[PDB]
Design a protein around this nucleic acid. Structure first.
Lengths: 199, 199
DNA sequence: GGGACACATGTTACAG
DNA sequence: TGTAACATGTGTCCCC
């Protein structure tokens, strides 16, 4: 029974060589996130890299109560600014036409893997077609707006989002724990230009 | 020499045994801080606690930088509204505009059990209510103060004493022989913001 | 020469 | 069973 021990040992070896390389490479990542906090006076070993990760987390847990009070405060200041701006009416109509608000008919509603926030969807502006990413996952289901037409912003530059190119942006009114999209009352031909000036 | 051979080993073994104990006891301590894994049936092996803490820090770093941006924005608002209300820009008046002195109204005052000289006030600023503690019980009765409009420092950091949170503190002046609160001369609406009188 | 490291085996749990 | 996850003890390397 010697030919088996030659392979039973070679199997156990690369089991641990995978486990060793796994943990020791995961500690290396931790070393990149911790702050230096000092000059080259202490050598970064696993003993200290871990101790630093613990000490780093506890400090971050201490700042948690401060941020909770800021998010509460911003909900109150956003409500004030929302009402304050209501009495500043100085938009030049030339500066409004710079923005091209357009009606778009939805074609795809591809959810995005590993993401409970963003939804990928292919829109159609008539002749032109675009793909836009929308952070509306937790509220709007994908197979809900397929075929129905919505209002977006067109004159934008294509920017990669979550590894996806999104040339455009979707309008949405929010109320915190719930948000809606913008939708034409009566059906119109998609790709239509929104215009405030009366003709 | 076979003793010196073992003595070199028995020491070498103990030095390493103390090293692994340290970097394993950190992973244990690192596990006490990682939150629940959304699965009440989960195996917490080291390779995952390291992976977990890495991801848990990458997430806390984003949340930290977010509040870092928010407090900057909120600080910018206070700066704008502060320079708004003071049209005649004066350099020497600075260091005092930072103080938000306002006229409040004592809705209800009650003595605090266990304190000889403390008083729990319930101030109204018109817009909102406030609970402020002041140490003037040895001089003012709770029956006197009700309805009396007092000037208070309405933007002091909330300091908790006697388990009650004093949101700002009232103004008082004492000559040593006596003590009085600071009121406005003519009757003005609650929540009126004091300012320097000059032209 | 002592502290940190990676590597090859002995032990336990009880997977898949 | 035979992995998968934790354990110990020994040899190479480092410092400059």
């Amino acid at each position: 029974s010697l030919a088996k021990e030659r392979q039973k040992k070679d199997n156990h070896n690369l089991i641990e060589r995978r486990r060793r390389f796994n943990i020791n490479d995961r500690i290396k990542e931790l070393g990149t996130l911790i702050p230096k906090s000092n000059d080259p006076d202490m050598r970064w070993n696993k003993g200290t890299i871990l101790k630093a990760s613990v000490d780093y987390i506890r400090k971050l847990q201490r700042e948690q109560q401060r941020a909770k009070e800021l998010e509460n405060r911003q909900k109150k200041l956003e409500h004030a600014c929302r009402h304050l701006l209501l009495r500043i009416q100085e938009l030049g109509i030339e500066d409004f036409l710079k923005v091209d608000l357009r009606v778009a008919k939805v074609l795809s509603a591809e959810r995005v893997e590993g993401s409970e926030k963003l939804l990928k969807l292919t829109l159609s502006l008539g002749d032109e077609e675009r793909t836009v990413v929308a952070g509306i996952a937790k509220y709007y289901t994908p197979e809900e707006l397929v075929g129905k037409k919505i209002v977006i912003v067109a004159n934008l530059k294509p920017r990669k989002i979550f590894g996806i190119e999104s040339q455009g942006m979707i309008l949405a009114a929010s109320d915190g724990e719930n948000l809606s999209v913008i939708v034409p009352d009566r059906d119109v031909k998609e790709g239509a230009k929104l215009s405030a000036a009366l003709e």
